[PDB]
């Protein structure tokens, strides 16, 4: 589920390996997600549409990270406990068997709850820290 990252792979070369042997391309994956590629004709519209859609994708992802207190990092520990309804998952295969491309299917149908949980916990922590600073 974690390990020491690298950037020399260039792009998505892993993939395939387990999560503990695949969560290491985070730098390069973050890089390539936005960088590049770059008589009357209209394909300027197509190029602008593609560029704007990519930029909006990146901004939405960064905003979702920012709400949860995770902006400024790729890895991010959080406070939300594992759901009361799950308490069951196959962690023995999380650590060293399932690749991300497989694990992403098992968290589907439940991801929507996790974002709300993270948001609520972060806002509680925010107001708690503000109160703590305002205590004295």
């Amino acid at each position: 589920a974690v390990g020491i990252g690298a950037v020399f792979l260039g792009f998505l070369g892993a993939a395939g390996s387990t999560m503990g042997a695949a969560s290491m391309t985070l730098t390069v994956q973050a890089r390539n997600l936005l960088s590049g590629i770059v008589k009357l004709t209209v394909w300027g519209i197509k190029q602008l549409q593609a560029r704007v859609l990519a930029v909006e994708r990146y901004l939405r992802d960064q905003q979702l990270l920012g709400i949860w207190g995770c902006s400024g990092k790729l890895i991010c520990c959080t406070n939300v406990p594992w759901n009361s309804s799950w308490s069951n998952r196959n962690l023995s295969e999380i650590w060293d068997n399932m690749t991300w491309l497989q694990w992403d299917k098992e968290i589907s149908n439940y991801t929507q709850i996790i974002y709300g949980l993270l948001e609520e916990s972060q806002n509680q922590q925010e107001k708690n820290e503000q109160d703590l600073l305002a205590l004295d």
Binding site: A15, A50, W82
Partner: protein, 480 residues
């Protein structure tokens, strides 16, 4: 949950199979962005197409060539390119005046095919004889004076018998339905290789295990930023200037038992074909309107009576034999019997292609006249015909006129694939063997090249359990 906490991860290797608009990457470089068009100078991007392939350890992905939307993207891009490029050019509407035509005349030329001088067009029957000499009143620039111009048209470009069967008066064929536009001479454009590059946030996957049937898993997967050079060539009954499979001949259909579904055959060794129109065409230039010029073939000087294509006999014979062997594997315990073209419009009843801006049509009955798993038990010559007025693709309503090209024209090509269909009802004991050549949408041509690729969007955010509670505690957990 005293040992169990979530964790956010970003930049994670996950993707899903969405659809998007791809970038056009040129050859790097043949584009003069406005001076002339070679394929897409006004529109497409010149940039480095270096694929930079990457292999993946244990990925297994499902590919489908028939549902590959990139062929639809190619279709739309090609149609838009041709439509916007032909728009500024001259209109042929003023040229639809009544045409009085008569048989051509030869000023003592010589014939290639026989050791004697030309005597009569009816016996010297090629180029001369199929081509009519027409004269017509046309307007000068000042709109108050008219003159008797003349030009020579191919017989398919003119239509009698709606001018009554005794008048010897001809129209242009297009005027019955639509008005044509001439191709701009500076715009003349040819099959430059093109590469497709994914936009930001998308990855183009490629399958290397070439021998998969076309719809199933592929294990030798690889990732590429820009596809290899695809040539936007269009031809019917035969793919040319294509790639080649590393294994021997390959055959592809979503259901071979579904007879109406086209069968694409992909070769491993190319068969060279040479096509030529001898004789020096003289480009006549006649004025229309204030500042428009119309090009037409004047007299044809030099030796005349040929319009041919040539194919090596034994090479094509063995290629067809290997096709027959593979189809015998797929269709067990029965022969394979190739046959003449089924019929239909001449754009698909004949092999079609363009060389040097001149459109060719060639009778292919010489080529598919086979028998059991091969031909029956030296160069094969194809008689051909030429048109100038063109319906752009199959049956779309956009017409076009091709200006003639002066001097003799010769082109070479590598035949790489075939397009076939099968006989229908049965008569079981005597039907499965039959196969014929068939036409093809340009989707069928481009599928043989965009076979390999798939488009997926990155989902760079993921969640998983880890050992950390934020600022508080650790974890007890499991292992494989």
């Amino acid at each position: 949950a005293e040992n169990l906490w979530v964790t956010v991860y970003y930049g994670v290797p996950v993707w899903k199979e969405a659809k998007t608009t791809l970038f056009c990457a040129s050859d790097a470089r043949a584009y003069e962005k406005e001076v002339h068009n070679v394929w897409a100078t006004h529109a497409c991007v010149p940039t480095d197409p270096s694929p930079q392939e990457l292999f993946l350890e244990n990925v297994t992905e499902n590919f489908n060539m028939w549902k590959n939307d990139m062929v639809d993207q190619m279709h739309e891009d090609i149609i838009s390119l041709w439509d916007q490029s032909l728009k500024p050019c001259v209109k042929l509407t003023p040229l639809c005046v009544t045409l009085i035509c008569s048989n051509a005349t030869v000023n003592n030329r010589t014939a290639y095919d026989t050791r004697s001088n030309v005597n009569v067009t009816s016996i010297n029957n090629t180029i001369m004889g199929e081509m009519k000499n027409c004269s017509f009143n046309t307007t000068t620039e000042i709109r108050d004076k008219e003159k008797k111009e003349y030009a020579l048209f191919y017989k398919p470009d003119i239509v009698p018998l709606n001018e009554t069967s005794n008048t010897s008066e001809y129209r242009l064929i297009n005027c019955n339905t639509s008005a044509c536009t001439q191709a701009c001479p500076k715009v003349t454009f040819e099959p430059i290789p093109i590469h497709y590059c994914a936009p930001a946030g998308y990855a183009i996957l490629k399958c290397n295990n070439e021998t998969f049937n076309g719809t199933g898993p592929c294990s030798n997967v690889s990732t590429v930023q820009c596809t290899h050079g695809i040539r936007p060539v269009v031809s019917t009954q035969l793919l040319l200037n294509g790639s080649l499979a590393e294994k021997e001949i390959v055959i592809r259909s979503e259901n071979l038992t579904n007879n109406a579904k086209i069968i694409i055959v992909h070769l491993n060794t190319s068969v060279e074909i040479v096509c030529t129109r001898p004789g020096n065409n003289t480009r006549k230039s006649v004025r229309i309107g204030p500042g428009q010029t119309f090009y037409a073939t004047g007299d044809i000087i030099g030796d005349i009576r040929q319009a041919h294509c040539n194919i090596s006999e034994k090479q094509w014979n063995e290629t067809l034999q290997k096709v027959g062997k593979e189809l015998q594997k797929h269709f067990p315990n029965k022969t394979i019997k190739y046959e003449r073209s089924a019929g239909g419009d001449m754009e698909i009843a004949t092999h079609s292609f363009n060389c040097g801006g001149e459109f060719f049509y060639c009778n292919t009955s010489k080529l598919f006249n086979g028998t059991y798993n091969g031909t029956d038990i030296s160069t094969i010559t194809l008689q051909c015909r030429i048109k100038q007025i063109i319906n752009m693709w199959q049956g779309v309503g956009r017409c076009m006129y091709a200006p003639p090209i002066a001097g003799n024209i010769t082109c070479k090509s590598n035949i790489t694939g075939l397009l076939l269909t099968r006989d229908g009802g049965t008569n079981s004991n005597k039907t499965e063997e039959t196969f014929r050549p068939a036409g093809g949408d340009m989707r069928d041509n481009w599928r043989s090249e965009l076979y390999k690729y798939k488009v997926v969007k990155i989902e760079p955010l993921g969640v998983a359990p880890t050992r950390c509670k934020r600022r508080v505690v650790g974890r007890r957990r499991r292992r494989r």
